[PDB]
Amino acid sequence: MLENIRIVLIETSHSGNIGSAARAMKTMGLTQLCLVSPKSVDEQSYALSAGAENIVKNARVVDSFDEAVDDCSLVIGTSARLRHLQNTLIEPRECAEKVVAYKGKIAIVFGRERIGLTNEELLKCHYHLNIPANPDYSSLNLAMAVQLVSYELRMAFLVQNNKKIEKNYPTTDQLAYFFDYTERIYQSLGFIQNQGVMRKLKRLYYRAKLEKNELNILNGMLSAVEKRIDLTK
Amino acid sequence: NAMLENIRIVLIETSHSGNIGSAARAMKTMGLTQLCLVSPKSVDEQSYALSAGAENIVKNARVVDSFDEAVDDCSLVIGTSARLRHLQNTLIEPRECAEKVVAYKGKIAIVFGRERIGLTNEELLKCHYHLNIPANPDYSSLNLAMAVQLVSYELRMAFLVQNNKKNSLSLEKNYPTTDQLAYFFDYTERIYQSLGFIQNQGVMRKLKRLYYRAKLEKNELNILNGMLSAVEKRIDLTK
Numbered sequence: 099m100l101e102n103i104r105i106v107l108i109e110t111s112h113s114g115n116i117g118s119a120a121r122a123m124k125t126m127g128l129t130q131l132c133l134v135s136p137k138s139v140d141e142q143s144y145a146l147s148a149g150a151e152n153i154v155k156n157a158r159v160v161d162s163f164d165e166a167v168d169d170c171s172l173v174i175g176t177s178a179r180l181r182h183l184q185n186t187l188i189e190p191r192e193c194a195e196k197v198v199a200y201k202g203k204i205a206i207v208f209g210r211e212r213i214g215l216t217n218e219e220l221l222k223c224h225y226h227l228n229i230p231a232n233p234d235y236s237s238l239n240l241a242m243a244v245q246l247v248s249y250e251l252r253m254a255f256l257v258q259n260n261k262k263i264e265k266n267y268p269t270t271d272q273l274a275y276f277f278d279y280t281e282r283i284y285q286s287l288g289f290i291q292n293q294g295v296m297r298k299l300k301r302l303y304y305r306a307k308l309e310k311n312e313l314n315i316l317n318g319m320l321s322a323v324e325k326r327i328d329l330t331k
Numbered sequence: 332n333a334m335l336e337n338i339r340i341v342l343i344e345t346s347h348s349g350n351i352g353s354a355a356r357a358m359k360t361m362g363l364t365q366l367c368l369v370s371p372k373s374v375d376e377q378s379y380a381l382s383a384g385a386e387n388i389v390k391n392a393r394v395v396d397s398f399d400e401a402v403d404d405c406s407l408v409i410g411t412s413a414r415l416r417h418l419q420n421t422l423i424e425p426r427e428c429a430e431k432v433v434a435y436k437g438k439i440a441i442v443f444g445r446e447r448i449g450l451t452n453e454e455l456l457k458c459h460y461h462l463n464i465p466a467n468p469d470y471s472s473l474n475l476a477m478a479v480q481l482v483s484y485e486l487r488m489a490f491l492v493q494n495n496k497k498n499s500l501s502l503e504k505n506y507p508t509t510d511q512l513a514y515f516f517d518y519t520e521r522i523y524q525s526l527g528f529i530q531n532q533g534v535m536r537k538l539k540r541l542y543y544r545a546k547l548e549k550n551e552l553n554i555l556n557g558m559l560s561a562v563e564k565r566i567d568l569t570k
Contacts, residue, residue: 122477127467149470191488229484230491232362235384242357242480245473249481252465253426289561298554306545315537322528323562330569 100255103197104158105244106132106166106207108215113138115211117146118241120153126248127255131157132166132205163207163219170205172197175215175223176243178236182217183226185293190247193227194254199270206247211240268313273303276313279320286327335490338432339365339393340479341401341442343450348373352381353476354443355388361483362490367393367440369401398442398454405440407432410450410458411478413471418461425482428462429489443478505549512542515552518559525566 105123110116116139120131131153133139139154147154160166167173174193177183188196197204207223209215214237220226229238229246238246277300284290308316340358345351351374355366359382366388368374374389382389395401402408409428412418423431432439442458444450455461464473464481473481507515516539523529547555 121474124470125466125473125477148474230487231360232487235359238360238480239353239356239383239476242360242476245477245480246484249464249484256465284558284561287558287561287565289558295554298551302545302547302551306541308541311537312541315534319523319528322523322526323565326526326562326565326569330565 100127100251101129102200102203103128103251104130104132104166104170104203104205105248106134106205107136107240107244108134108163108166108207108219109210110136110240111211112240113140113142114146115240116143116157117148117150117154118239119208119244120147120150120157122241122245123248124150124153125245126252128248128251129153129156133157133159134163134166135161163222167205167207167222170203172200172202172204172225173207173223174204174225174227175207175220176209176247177215177220177226177228179228180220180226183220186224187226187228189228189230190250191254193225193247194250196225197251198254198258208240208243212237266310268308268310272310272313273308276303276308276317276320279317283320283323283327287323333362333364334433335362335486336364337438338363338486339367339402339405339438339440340483341367341369341440342371342475342479343369343398343401343442343444343454345371345475346446348375348377349381350475351378351389351392352383352385354479355382355385355392357476357480358483359385359388360480361487363483363486364388364391366391367395367401369398370396398450398457402440402442402457405438407435407437407439408442408458409439409460409462410442410455411444411482412449412455412461412463414463415461418455421458421460422463423460424463424465425485426489428460428482429485431460432486433489433493441482443475446475447472503548507547507549507552511549511552512547515556515559516542518556522559522562522566526562 105119105128107116107119110133116133116136123129123131136159143154144151179187207215229243277296280299281290281296290296340363342351342354345368351368351371358366371394378389379386414422442450444454462482464478466473516535519538520529520535
């Protein structure tokens with residue numbers, strides 16, 4: 099379900115925004131709202147929720163970011179395209195596709211009304227979600243950003259349910275391990291000297307859509323090489 | 332630039348003057364600039380306040396008394412609507428809708444009907460397509476600003492994907508030759524037989540299948556040949 103997604107708002111300054119976000123969530127089928135030290139949750143939150151009062155009432159209220167995301171193994175924060183976030187920057191479409199496919203708890207984290215998220219809060223996210231926007235005017239209202247992300251989450255959920263089609267292949271930990279395994283070895287061999295190799299390698303292996311059998315063989319090859327490396331220090 | 336400027340956003344009878352502001356803001360975040368109001372109930376400081384830096388859009392908005400004037404000079408007209416069964420032939424959702432707008436060689440009005448009322452029979456008949464936003468069946472009413480934000484966003488995404496297309500087709504005239512890939516397979520074989528990994532021809536067969544299915548780029552082949560050389564140097568250093 100959309101039930102494993104927690105929507106987290108950090109220090110919402112305007113209490114109406116919380117109602118608007120509850121409404122936007124409910125409109126798309128989301129329910130789990132989390133507020134990290136909201137400035138206030140009040141009659142204005144309840145009024146703007148307009149039928150989504152249940153989402154507001156059931157909101158988890160916590161005093162910290164870490165508390166908000168304590169049992170989520172995937173954490174995504176909304177961000178501007180800051181230079182230092184370039185390797186983990188993603189957009190809502192790809193994000194929605196990642197999320198709907200994820201096994202486990204996911205938190206999507208929206209920052210403060212003007213400021214967004216601090217770098218320290220950003221460091222606590224695995225991916226950084228950027229909404230493509232007018233470069234001259236690229237900050238959304240907090241509830242509208244939630245509305246758009248909630249909307250791509252439902253588009254992705256529906257597309258997936260249109261097939262539920264079905265094919266057992268390779269699981270994502272098996273594959274990310276294949277990467278790390280590949281990275282360790284070829285780094286050891288003097289070959290990998292930056293991220294570029296591992297970027298092309300994943301772009302290739304996705305395209306191929308490795309069968310479980312194929313992952314097996316590429317894995318046995320790593321081991322055979324490791325044996326020789328390990329049998330040479 | 333923007334061919335987002337050939338798109339007029341029309342808001343039918345807005346109520347709270349703040350809603351005009353919140354819609355102008357949503358538009359500006361996505362690069363839309365043309366706003367038209369039909370008989371707004373009121374426009375005042377709140378229309379400006381809620382625009383949050385999108386005042387220009389509110390200042391320049393048209394204000395008319397009729398749907399006909401509101402869509403003057405637009406030959407593609409899209410009205411938002413509930414999933415009304417009698418409109419089944421012309422109902423579309425925001426993704427398909429944006430692809431059509433973006434390929435439309437003329438001016439387009441997208442008309443946002445009144446919250447929880449929609450458009451009249453006459454107004455619906457005057458739309459070429461009817462735009463419904465997939466939503467919770469149990470709670471499907473977007474307020475005005477939410478609806479404009481989402482349609483504007485799909486519009487911008489349609490615009491970007493179309494402009495990414497116009498560039499990238501020219502941008503992979505480098506695929507390896509048959510002999511290059513073949514050389515790579517014999518090289519993989521030799522090396523992995525040298526290791527003591529290969530015992531039967533099935534490994535190579537499955538590998539060719541994999542790599543042919545992949546359709547290796549020349550630079551990908553380069554990397555993979557580079558790994559085999561990396562492994563080779565190590566083998567050649569042991570014995």
